[PDB]
Amino acid sequence: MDAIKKKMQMLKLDKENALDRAEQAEADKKAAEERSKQLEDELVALQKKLKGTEDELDKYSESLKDAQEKLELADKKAT
Amino acid sequence: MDAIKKKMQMLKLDKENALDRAEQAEADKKAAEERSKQLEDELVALQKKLKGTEDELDKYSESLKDAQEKLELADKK
């Protein structure tokens, strides 16, 4: 094949190989973005579960405070 | 310049443009995947915080139950 024609064939092949690289990276990028969206949703659900747990801890801490409160007034006459 | 040298020039241009797009795309993929990794670490850390909170909650439930047991002893006297 003529040298000039061969060079042109190679430039075309190089372009195609690069477009293929871009297509694959763009697909991988979209995949990562979707994974990140799902992870953000997991973090929000977990944060809500933690908030619920902290609220319950406060409820227990308050109830315990009342109990130790009543226990003192109670054991006033253990004899 | 001949049309043959000119066509060759346009082909070299198409190639450079495709390569530029490929490199930008690979850089965006890298950045996106790093963000996913960052979120994964935030999740591990949050799960650890929740576990520690659930452990403290168990500690208080046990103490409250014990104080209720003792309060029963008081009344039952």
From Swiss-Prot, chain B:
Subcellular locations according to the entry: Cytoplasm, Cytoskeleton
Signal peptide: none
One GO biological process term: cardiac muscle contraction
Molecular-function annotations in GO: actin filament binding; cytoskeletal protein binding; identical protein binding; protein heterodimerization activity; protein homodimerization activity
UniProt KW keywords: Acetylation, Actin-binding, Coiled coil, Cytoplasm, Cytoskeleton, Muscle protein
Region (Disordered): 1-38
Keyword presence, tRNA-binding: no
Family designation: Belongs to the tropomyosin family.
Protein's UniProt name: Tropomyosin alpha-1 chain
Section covered of the full-length record: 1 to 77 of 284
